[PDB]
Amino acid sequence: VGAXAXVXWXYXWXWX
Amino acid sequence: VGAXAXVXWXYXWXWX
Numbered sequence: 001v002g003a004x005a006x007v008x009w010x011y012x013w014x015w016x
Numbered sequence: 017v018g019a020x021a022x023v024x025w026x027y028x029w030x031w032x
Contacts, residue, residue, distance in 0.1 A: 002026060004018010 005011035021027035 001022060002018070002020010004020075004024055006017060006022055008020055010018060 001007045003009040006013070008014045010016045017023045019025040022029070024030045026032050
């Protein structure tokens with residue numbers, strides 16, 4: 001949860 | 017995986 005990959009910024013879900 | 021919470025920088029495991 002936050003940044004890199006997962007829920008948040010970069011990869012997976014959220015933004016990027 | 018990366019930053020915020022999980023595996024990487026901030027919370028959970030890795031650094032912070």
